């Protein structure tokens with residue numbers, strides 16, 4: 001048994017676990033050190049054209065430490081500027097993978113209620129970032145999935161559930177609670193008091209399997225779209241960080257090496273080993289992360305990883321350039337009077353092209369976790385985009401525009417103008433939200449004892465649109 | 472020292488080495504067991520369109536055992552039907568990687584003379600297949616490169632020469648005498664008796680490095696073409712089995728694992744280890760070839776290799792389909808009156824597309840030796856082909872043919888009709904050569920003591936155009 005066998009009062013606040021587990025708590029907090037904001041729309045402005053009409057065209061940054069997850073959810077322009085609990089663009093589901101308060105609220109309101117309403121609904125309740133309670137039972141400290149959609153997805157794909165899995169499988173599945181592709185399923189229900197309500201429920205599209213092509217077939221069968229493209233009017237699918245799904249295609253996943261083997265390696269003390277809880281870049285500490293299994297030099301292994309990154313970059317830039325041109329050429333054909341019927345096959349190719357290429361790139365470690373699948377997916381996506389473009393030349397010709405040259409989108413600014421994103425406006429609106437309602441959320445949470453101000457130290461120094469200078 | 476320190480009389484006949492090295496001789500001869508003819512034009516008829524105007528559009532099969540190398544050189548339709556030493560389509564250089572008689576003849580006539588004249592010039596001299604003398608010194612039995620163009624290539628690429636290399640490097644370089652990409656450099660010279668002569672000299676295009684892109688730059692700088700495409704009139708480059716060059720890109724090559732580690736593994740006897748000389752498929756004997764370094768099951772490792780093959784097939788079929796369509800669409804634009812100036816950029820894209828895709832596929836183990844580079848090359852080649860095709864739509868439109876559909880080439884027969892290859896004719900001509908001059912070559916060689924009839928057992932049972940039923 002543990003020293004807390006009856007459970008932990010205030011379990012959602014990770015600081016409550018420190019009295020039992022100071023070493024894990026200390027390493028866990030050090031994800032504070034990974035504070036860099038890499039603006040992916042600035043680095044890869046093609047992505048802005050790809051996501052025209054969708055919030056990712058406003059703000060999309062690379063992942064940083066878990067310490068920043070909740071605050072980054074609040075800061076992103078994607079969550080907009082609510083004025084109260086009933087406003088703002090996005091739903092409650094946007095908290096789900098950000099906070100140990102999520103399982104707390106599900107365990108209290110129920111899953112459907114939690115998934116009902118606006119993101120802003122829970123601003124003064126969901127206030128702790130990725131914590132011990134997201135991954136551990138507060139009585140036994142055993143690894144646990146705390147979200148019901150993971151087992152749902154596992155079963156649908158023919159996998160064992162979390163409870164049915166081996167320990168080594170659990171050492172990846174805990175991460176898969178969050179590090180997976182998902183969509184929101186509109187779900188009608190009726191509450192305790194008989195009121196009809198609509199939830200938007202996190203759902204893993206895994207019932208045909210976890211390959212990119214199986215998920216594409218799933219989404220096509222249910223005629224699903226995440227949005228209608230703001231330029232080409234294609235019914236689009238958004239990939240989100242399919243980290244676990246791609247990791248399963250790759251040699252390490254095939255061999256049985258878990259997420260935790262590289263990202264939470266064991267550290268040394270006799271009978272008292274412990275797991276490094278500073279989840280970050282395994283290349284920072286290769287002796288702990290790789291050199292237990294590898295006999296090459298660290299430098300040769302790092303050079304190999306760099307090569308993989310460069311291969312992915314090469315194919316990523318080609319795919320998204322053709323995807324971007326295809327969207328723009330479709331928009332031009334629409335301007336000239338091309339019909340939906342004339343554009344249907346083209347739009348199908350664009351949807352598929354971008355689904356495949358986004359699934360390849362949306363997991364930021366996939367270029368390493370599953371290099372060969374990433375390259376094959378980028379190649380396949382590019383081919384779909386080029387099939388669209390070949391068909392588009394003939395549509396453009398039909399309407400007298402065979403010599404049309406799609407505009408360039410080589411800077412974020414130029415791309416956002418094509419996507420009709422008024423950043424200035426969104427940022428100004430966001431700042432006013434942060435200055436008012438967000439501060440009310442934090443004050444109320446602290447007053448109620450849901451939030452410890454210690455957790456906020458340096459948490460809000462940077463976003464893609466400000467930098468006070470260090471997190 | 473060896474038991475043959477003064478050298479071996481008749482060294483080019485491998486059977487002369489048997490008295491010293493019965494175990495190596497016995498295993499070496501067992502490449503007889505790899506007798507399958509896989510007709511690659513039947514399997515991948517797109518290749519026929521790709522090679523229209525070039526001998527590979529007639530006959531191209533997968534590699535089989537070394538035991539068949541010389542006979543396969545004679546059988547292939549590519550070497551045609553000489554009637555004497557001054558006829559036939561191909562040059563003397565075509566023997567170079569087929570026979571221990573090659574170093575013998577170079578050591579006697581000189582390199583330039585050897586490289587001067589027709590393939591048929593040496594039909595009654597070059598009569599032994601890949602032998603001990605291709606890889607070993609006949610005094611010391613040490614590993615030796617016997618062909619001068621390898622060191623030339625190594626130096627040009629900044630590599631150490633064979634003599635300067637480590638033992639483990641030599642255990643790949645011996646193979647690289649043959650298992651490399653090459654071209655024939657037209658070389659004017661004057662002989663002993665002052666006669667002007669023209670050699671066609673095997674040359675490795677490595678002076679900018681050994682990557683596919685570096686070789687493409689090399690060939691472009693010297694304005695080289697292997698042939699003018701029979702359909703698109705593009706100045707084409709042919710890739711030939713760049714096995715070693717690609718192997719160097721791959722993780723095993725990067726780690727230092729040699730060709731011989733997998734293909735000529737050590738076998739067990741105490742102080743008397745020996746190397747398995749039956750060069751073939753390492754997957755036939757995984758315990759000898761892989762399981763010394765790998766802890767996964769054999770079956771899991773084989774399943775992984777199958778996955779790599781399937782990825783390569785997927786991308787290969789896409790690339791060559793678009794390459795084939797691009798050649799055919801160019802031919803149609805030419806028929807309509809398109810000018811060379813109008814087609815110049817297109818033809819450049821086709822040349823590059825096919826160079827990259829052929830370099831990816833022409834090494835039949837590359838999908839395993841360097842999987843990620845193979846996928847990246849197929850992706851890059853496909854992109855070049857699709858750039859050509861997009862430009863072609865506009866040329867076709869200019870000439871009133873925007874709705875043109877390039878013909879299908881899904882069978883060898885259909886593809887060869889598009890390529891204007893009269894197989895029947897070539898085969899009939901070939902059989903008459905085999906029935907007459909080839910038999911004269913063999914009879915003369917046996918009479919002169921250059922050829923042992925024992926070496927011919929079952930060697931000529933199969934080609935792509937006959938099968939007496941077993942080799």
Ligand code: HEM
Pocket residue numbers: 034062063064065066067068069070072073096097098099130134135174175176177178179259260263264279280281
């Ligand atoms: C042991 C399992 C896990 C692994 C190996 C893992 C891995 C990672 C890595 C490497 C990063 C980026 C860190 C950096 O850039 O330095 C990250 C960020 C992130 N992870 Fe995890 N993670 C795990 C569990 C989870 C869980 C359970 C959740 C959800 C409750 C989650 C949600 C996130 C979020 C939202 C971010 C982005 C943080 C931000 O940018 O502010 N992860 N994770």
Ligand code: HEM
Pocket residue numbers: 059060061062063064072073076078079090093094095096097177178179180182202241362363364
């Ligand atoms: C649409 C509602 C959501 C919003 C607004 C949101 C917001 C964010 C933000 C701002 C980031 C940091 C990187 C970035 O700037 O994009 C992030 C990263 C991340 N989120 Fe979410 N999130 C949402 C839904 C989800 C869900 C439902 C999950 C779990 C199933 C999840 C898991 C993660 C993970 C694992 C990362 C780090 C990996 C990466 O960004 O590639 N997110 N999210």
Ligand code: HEM
Pocket residue numbers: 014017018021024025026028029130131132133134135136141143170171174175260264273274275276277
């Ligand atoms: C400060 C908060 C946390 C505390 C106090 C805590 C505590 C512990 C303890 C006591 C162990 C077993 C001993 C060890 O291997 O170190 C452990 C291991 C582990 N924890 Fe945590 N943990 C925390 C946060 C997290 C989070 C957020 C995750 C998921 C993203 C996580 C995932 C894991 C994993 C995968 C192991 C390895 C388990 C095994 O191999 O048996 N931990 N942690």
Ligand code: HEM
Pocket residue numbers: 251252255257261262282283289290291292293294301302304305368371722765766767
């Ligand atoms: C971040 C740390 C690591 C790095 C940089 C790394 C690097 C690599 C690379 C480059 C490969 C070749 C596969 C490919 O094409 O991608 C590989 C394969 C492999 N790695 Fe790792 N690795 C790491 C961690 C580990 C760990 C912790 C283990 C053991 C638990 C491991 C065991 C293996 C195994 C079993 C293979 C398959 C090839 C074989 O059987 O040797 N690796 N790794």
Ligand code: HEM
Pocket residue numbers: 062063064172175176179243244247252253257258259260261262263281282283305363364365366368369
């Ligand atoms: C599903 C299990 C895993 C998850 C959820 C996961 C999570 C992640 C994430 C989110 C990233 C991107 C971080 C960023 O760009 O900010 C990443 C990168 C990476 N991961 Fe994992 N990982 C998993 C398995 C593994 C394994 C098994 C290994 C080692 C064999 C590994 C080694 C790495 C490496 C070397 C990087 C790239 C670091 C760099 O190049 O900067 N990961 N991982």
Ligand code: HEM
Pocket residue numbers: 505533534535536537538539540541543544567568569570601605606645646647648649650730731734735750751752
């Ligand atoms: C130890 C170094 C070498 C390795 C690892 C190697 C590997 C191979 C392999 C695996 C095959 C196909 C075997 C099969 O399908 O069963 C092959 C065929 C071939 N090899 Fe090598 N080889 C080596 C040395 C050489 C040398 C030195 C030459 C030139 C003198 C050469 C020329 C050829 C030729 C012409 C074929 C095709 C035979 C035919 O299809 O009739 N190889 N080699």
Ligand code: HEM
Pocket residue numbers: 530531532533534535543544547549550561564565566567568648649650651653673712833834835
């Ligand atoms: C143009 C003159 C040549 C001809 C007619 C010729 C003929 C052949 C034939 C018939 C094969 C069996 C596979 C097939 O059907 O294509 C073969 C395979 C092979 N040849 Fe040649 N060859 C020539 C030049 C060379 C040269 C100069 C080298 C060495 C630098 C070489 C090395 C090899 C190797 C290593 C193979 C087995 C690998 C593979 O086919 O992918 N060949 N050759």
Ligand code: HEM
Pocket residue numbers: 485488489492495496497499500601602603604605606607612614641642645646731735744745746747748
């Ligand atoms: C029947 C003809 C041959 C004979 C009698 C012969 C003889 C030998 C001998 C005595 C050794 C050293 C002992 C051993 O490792 O087994 C050896 C090794 C070797 N031979 Fe051969 N060999 C023949 C054909 C070839 C050919 C055609 C090649 C090249 C394609 C070749 C390449 C090698 C290699 C790479 C080694 C390993 C050398 C080392 O690791 O030190 N052999 N052979």
Ligand code: HEM
Pocket residue numbers: 251294295296722723726728732733753754760761762763764765772773775776839842
């Ligand atoms: C035909 C036999 C073999 C097979 C099927 C095989 C399979 C593999 C595979 C699938 C990988 C992952 C790299 C990739 O993405 O392609 C790999 C990597 C690797 N293999 Fe092999 N291999 C074989 C022979 C060998 C041998 C003989 C050695 C040792 C002399 C070796 C040592 C390695 C090493 C060092 C790596 C890099 C990853 C690591 O450091 O573990 N392999 N092999």
Ligand code: HEM
Pocket residue numbers: 533534535643646647650714715718723724728729730731732733734752753754776834835836837839840
């Ligand atoms: C430059 C050095 C090497 C050469 C010249 C070479 C030669 C070849 C050739 C010509 C093939 C195609 C045979 C055919 O399709 O008929 C092949 C396939 C293959 N080679 Fe190599 N090889 C080399 C290095 C290696 C190494 C280091 C390994 C092991 C790590 C290896 C393992 C294999 C495997 C597994 C196949 C595929 C067999 C199959 O899927 O049927 N090779 N090799």
Ligand SMILES: [Ca+2]
Pocket residue numbers: 181182183237238239240
């Ligand atoms: Ca999605």
Ligand SMILES: [Ca+2]
Pocket residue numbers: 652653654708709710711
């Ligand atoms: Ca060539």
Ligand SMILES: [Y+2]
Pocket residue numbers: 009016
């Ligand atoms: Y407490």
Ligand SMILES: [Y+2]
Pocket residue numbers: 034062063064065
């Ligand atoms: Y990061």
Ligand SMILES: [Y+2]
Pocket residue numbers: 287291298
């Ligand atoms: Y070290």
Ligand SMILES: [Y+2]
Pocket residue numbers: 371372842843
């Ligand atoms: Y790989």
